[PDB]
Structure 1
């Protein structure tokens, strides 16, 4: 208890139909190919999934998730003066947790990775209301990116995959 993001945990447990999901995912994937030519790449659904997707985006394989998580946490420590005003825990306590390989990533980590890699992080998400697939968010630093955006997709509001431009 007392986690920064405690207020997300229960509402995630409540939300949570394999068949309705399965159908939404065909449609998501179709609209993504059809409109952006992007493909969805399946990341393992352990606690590391956000960092798995970033690792796939940055290094080409989700097995580099531990390196990404480590770098992201070092960056957050080095920028604590900024990021600690967005975290309601003791900062060192927060990052200690978040260093653990099964700790789920969140907005704080996505913002840090955008700045740290100097690449915008685009988040894609299926909507039942439209077949549009513009990013729901694009996180970024202030520097001019020389590499393509890091693109992730957010599934069932609880999991991250990799969005590839093939």
Structure 2
């Protein structure tokens, strides 16, 4: 996709999500920590907590290494975070409904962590004002 077509896709998605669902795509810094940034914004309201989220995700995986060693979209990290925060994680992909949902412990289904996954492996935070 040409840079102009890419920007058209991004703009269409932001508008559709705002108009159809009332959600806002909050831009996270575009580094390799963007998944943890988006979750940090969802949980703490502040992407600066990204390294703490990552630390806690890694702590959770290590603690549960017997289970997670079965398995070694960021599926492993997303399951860990949904379980650890006891909230589902909903992943939007140029979509106004989630493409998939990590259920966590199947509690707090009305308060999901919502993230959007974009071109070039980037995640943003999907906020319900």
Normalization by structure 1: what TM-score? Answer: 0.73
Change (3 A) 1:133 1:157: farther
Unaligned runs of 5+ in 1: 1-15, 88-104, 127-131
Q: Secondary structure at the match of 1:83?
A: helix
- d(CA) in 1 for partners of 2:109, 2:21: 21
Alignment CA distance shift 1:22-1:153 (3 Å):
same
1:147, distance to aligned residue in structure 2 (A): 7.0
Count matched residues: 129
Secondary structure of the residue aligned to 1:119 is coil
Counterpart secondary structure, 1:163: strand
- Show structure 1 runs of 4+ deviating over 6 A: none
Bigger CA radius of gyration: 1
Seen in structure 2, the aligned counterparts of structure 1 residues 82 and 54 have a Cα distance that, compared at 3 Å, is: same
Unaligned runs of 5+ in 2: none
Deviations 1:75-95 (A, max 9, x none): 0111111111111xxxxxxxx
1:117-152 residue CA offsets vs partner (Å, 9 max, x unmatched): 0000000011xxxxx521011002234228710000
State the Cα deviation string for residues 9-56 of structure 1 (Å, max 9, x = none).
xxxxxxx82211110111101110111100000001111000000000
Inter-CA distance 146–135: structure 2 relative to 1 (3 Å threshold): closer
